[PDB]
Amino acid sequence: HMCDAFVGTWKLVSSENFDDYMKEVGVGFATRKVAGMAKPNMIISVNGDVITIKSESTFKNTEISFILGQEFDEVTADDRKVKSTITLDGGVLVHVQKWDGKSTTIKRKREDDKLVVECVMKGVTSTRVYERA
Numbered sequence: 001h002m003c004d005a006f007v008g009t010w011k012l013v014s015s016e017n018f019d020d021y022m023k024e025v026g027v028g029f030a031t032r033k034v035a036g037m038a039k040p041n042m043i044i045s046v047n048g049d050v051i052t053i054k055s056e057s058t059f060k061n062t063e064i065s066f067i068l069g070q071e072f073d074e075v076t077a078d079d080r081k082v083k084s085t086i087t088l089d090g091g092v093l094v095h096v097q098k099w100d101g102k103s104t105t106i107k108r109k110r111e112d113d114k115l116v117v118e119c120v121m122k123g124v125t126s127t128r129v130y131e132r133a
């Protein structure tokens with residue numbers, strides 16, 4: 001029910017410090033240049049307790065389906081094989097990805113008409129702002 005604010009089709013409108021975030025998660029030069037150009041969408045839907053987040057882009061297409069609190073395997077757009085757990089902290093979706101003893105945290109929040117994504121690994125923070133399609 002809290003997930004209702006997130007449901008719909010969203011398209012990337014702005015990006016801050018994303019190159020350095022990609023560097024921190026381990027993305028190489030060529031891939032960062034090509035991925036950096038992409039304008040992914042974010043299609044969020046719900047069926048019972050299952051949340052599905054799909055992203056399509058010229059870089060890579062991804063899809064995850066999950067239940068809140070329940071760890072799952074995810075393959076990220078940059079091909080990390082991660083263990084992911086997504087929880088609701090108030091009305092913020094908090095997504096932790098763990099692999100190879102590392103961790104990154106992705107928060108999705110509604111702010112005005114936007115869906116703001118903050119991505120954090122180590123000292124490095126990037127913001128990806130989406131708006132409704």
Ligand SMILES: O=C(O)C1=C(C(=O)Nc2sccc2-c2ccccc2)CCC1
Binds near residue numbers: 022036039059076106
């Ligand atoms: O690309 C993003 O805006 C978001 C996430 C992400 O980890 N993206 C990531 S992580 C490393 C690369 C990408 C990427 C780059 C271009 C297109 C699609 C994906 C997590 C949620 C929002």
